[model samples]
Target chain A: ATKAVCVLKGDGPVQGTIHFEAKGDTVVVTGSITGLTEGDHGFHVHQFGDNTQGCTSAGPHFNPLSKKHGGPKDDERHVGDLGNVTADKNGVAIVDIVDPLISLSGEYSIIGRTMVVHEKPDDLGRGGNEESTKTGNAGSRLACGVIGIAK
Target chain B: ATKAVCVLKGDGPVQGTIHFEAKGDTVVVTGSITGLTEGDHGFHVHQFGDNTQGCTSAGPHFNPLSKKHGGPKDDERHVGDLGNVTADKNGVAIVDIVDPLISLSGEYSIIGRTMVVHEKPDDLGRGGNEESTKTGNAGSRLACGVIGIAK
Candidate 1:
């Protein structure tokens, strides 16, 4: 079984466990995040998998569609946009999101993709930041993780 | 050798790889992100290392202090609160941040965190459509990758 490991950032502590099975253009994702505070945290599919400099080495979102950066509910946008997930004060978060653009199979899969948890929630555009048009309004490189088939 | 991978986000078409070593509470991260479209992408650390349900299994930021849902720059906030990383239009992003909270040898080591890419830039705390104070200013979730220590 292939395995994916999540690395913590120097700024904080985090741990994630995900199990996936790819089927054609769809991948069945199931797992949970623990040891976090209660609240909404920004979640997304990233491009890179290098946390060399802590977690800053990880890059932007994967938008092959090159559409406006918006939430999953938004129309005419990128493919890697999912929006946000709420975490409990107990520092525990549970999530479940599917990607029509990605798969778990060896081919046409986003396996090598990177996933990161932000310290805050996504604003979904409407933020005053210069790059607000792109990201969903999240912040800080809190923790980092990589997605790979279970080993 | 410890290896961390980051997936691209937003308009990024390429990916990155980071290789480094972590000792005690210090990790000297060094890596690069590629295939960007121009401008910077938001990156961050997540709480869990579970990819069971895709990346949704990895909960919020790893903040034991239960601080306010703020950025790393915030004086009072959770442990999993970092900032952002910049990328060029050429699809290349480089970063080097430090983490005193995470260790490759400790329970909080980065060996189990999720790294994600965003569809847009992070807004720090400017405000927008969603709860700006929750997930910072970063945009949508694009791609994701997990961190590994390369044992």
Candidate 2:
């Protein structure tokens, strides 16, 4: 029972602070992020914790079993695909991963949902357009938060 | 355009990272939080980013327009009231505040809403029983997140 995800980025200048630990069903993603802008970006775990208008109500992504898209060591992904994050050029972005299809404790657990950060670059779903399997096209949304339960 | 809020707490230990800057209608809350447990703690800004089943749906206390349960320089409050948060002695909670009825701009904005933390202590509504005016009774819900936007 370990979790903590606090990421930001708005008007510009990405922010970060992530940490989740499960080990049983596998889930140990580390953290350290900052004003990105060097390469890849597209990390998900969304499906509401609403973000009202800007985040467009933080929807789509946490495939609770509906499955589609891939990545995160594919096997048919989207437990909130933990795909890309590569930003170094001084802007920072270092997030270690270890995911077994994400779980904080069964039933496709992703705590209270919402953990988005995208601005393009996340074609884990095969960038062929048409929303790519259901949003690996990863665009829009620059910052989002919600994923609690820690200690 | 400034908004960044990321807080956590679950099973037990509390957490933190809050910041929302709006100057005009006043709203300059800073951040830095940790495992609280020394004194007061019952901050607000909730009403959905819908914490599914844990925050019991993050409903109430973000008044929208209907007010009651005041504090944060009450003059008649509940624009997602910004009140208590005093934790120290190893459990840190050093958050500098400057709220003016909280706003990010327009129809009483607070982004997507949902930012709770309480466990007892927040009787700002003159705790004379009966859940103290909507919820100054402030119990349960020890963690929740939402409030997004920066671009």
TM-score, cand. 2 vs. native: 0.33
Which predicted model would earn the best lDDT? Answer: 2
Residue-by-residue lDDT tens digits, candidate 1, A25-124: 4655556677776887777766555545555655777666676667766775456566776778888788776656545333233444566777778777
Q: Score the docking of each candidate (DockQ).
A: 0.11, 0.03
Off by over 4 Å in 2: A1-6, A9-37, A45-60, A64-67, A70-112, A116-123, A126-144, A147-151, B1-40, B43-61, B70-112, B117-121, B127-144, B147-151
The TM-score values for the models, in the order shown, are 0.47, 0.33
Worst 10 residues of 1 chain B by lDDT: B3-12
Model 1, B12-103: lDDT tens digits are 35566644466555665667777655675556666655655555555665565665456556676545555666787666778676655545
Docking class of 1: incorrect
Minimum summed lDDT over a 10-residue window in model 2 chain A is located at: A1-10
